[PDB]
């Protein structure tokens, strides 16, 4: 259908067990390159790219239904009804990781648990909260964006991947970046560091393993902290001694074990 063709649908595999994978911010469902070989032998994979991403249509980029992360629950719950999936295990890289949080406040009979890598409900400081950014950062990074997008992904995809600038993750990431519509990437930019996840933090029931890299240039550690302690769910930390924000992707070796044993065990 139209929705799941708009959003680079995949499904591997079959049977009931099921995964579900989503993306964050730049990148697209390449970013679990290193992830899908070792879940398909035992689940039915999903994947999927946000709307919005270089790869989608930029038609269909309402600014509208993308102004706040709601949008993207809808369309996650969408492929999911239209997939037929009663229940899945759901995978949520940066924004995914709340996207996926709020459909499971809409829709928690529809995760079994949340995976959340590189999350974060909020990244701006306040006088009692460590989210990693000063407003006055966000914009310079805005304005950044506005001024020359070329420049914009080519000096930020370093920072974002970490690791050796010019690694195969980090000329990747750059090309995922650049492959964004500027207009589309400026209002998701400002969609998503201006969001604030906190609030509802408590009101979330389904299960969340809480993945991060001991260094990430969006997320300090203390926001697993904050999550562990304000979701309402069981959940679960393991800061990853690996460096970056996309770190299934740029340190696979030491991530991906990490990712699985989360997948494959409960709390």
């Known amino acids: 259908g139209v929705v799941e063709e708009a959003h680079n649908v995949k499904v591997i595999g079959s049977g009931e067990a099921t995964i579900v994978l989503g993306h964050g911010f730049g990148t697209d469902q390449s970013v ?3 992830l899908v070989p070792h879940l398909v032998d035992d689940y ?3 994947i999927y790219d946000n709307m919005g991403a270089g790869t989608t249509n930029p038609d269909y980029f309402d600014f509208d239904r993308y102004s706040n992360l709601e949008g993207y629950s809808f369309d996650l719950i969408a492929i999911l009804e239209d997939l037929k999936i ?6 949520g890289h940066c924004v995914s990781a709340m996207i996926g949080v709020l459909a499971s406040l809409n829709r928690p009979d529809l995760f079994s648990k949340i995976v959340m890598i590189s999350a974060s409900p909020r990244y701006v400081n306040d006088v009692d ?3 990693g950014f000063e407003q006055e950062d966000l914009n310079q990074l805005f304005e950044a964006i506005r001024s020359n ?11 974002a991947v970490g690791g050796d600038m ?5 000329q990747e990431f750059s090309r995922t970046l650049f492959n964004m519509r500027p207009d589309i990437a400026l209002s998701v930019g400002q969609t998503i560091f201006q969001s604030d996840m906190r609030q509802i933090l408590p009101f979330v ?8 890299s001991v260094k990430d240039l969006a997320v300090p550690v203390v926001v697993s902290e904050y999550l562990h302690a304000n979701l309402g769910c069981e959940s679960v930390v393991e800061v ?11 340190s696979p070796d030491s991530v991906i074990p990490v990712i699985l044993r989360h997948i494959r065990n409960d709390i």
């Open 32 to 34: 679990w390159k290193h």
């Open 44 to 46: 039915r994979v999903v």
């Open 86 to 91: 009663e229940s899945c295990i759901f995978v």
């Open 129 to 131: 909260y460590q989210g």
């Open 149 to 159: 997008y070329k420049a914009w992904c080519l000096g930020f995809a370093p920072l």
């Open 166 to 170: 010019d690694s195969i993750a980090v």
């Open 205 to 212: 029931t389904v299960p969340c393993h809480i993945l991060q």
């Open 240 to 250: 990853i001694p690996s460096d970056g924000h996309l770190p299934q992707l740029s």
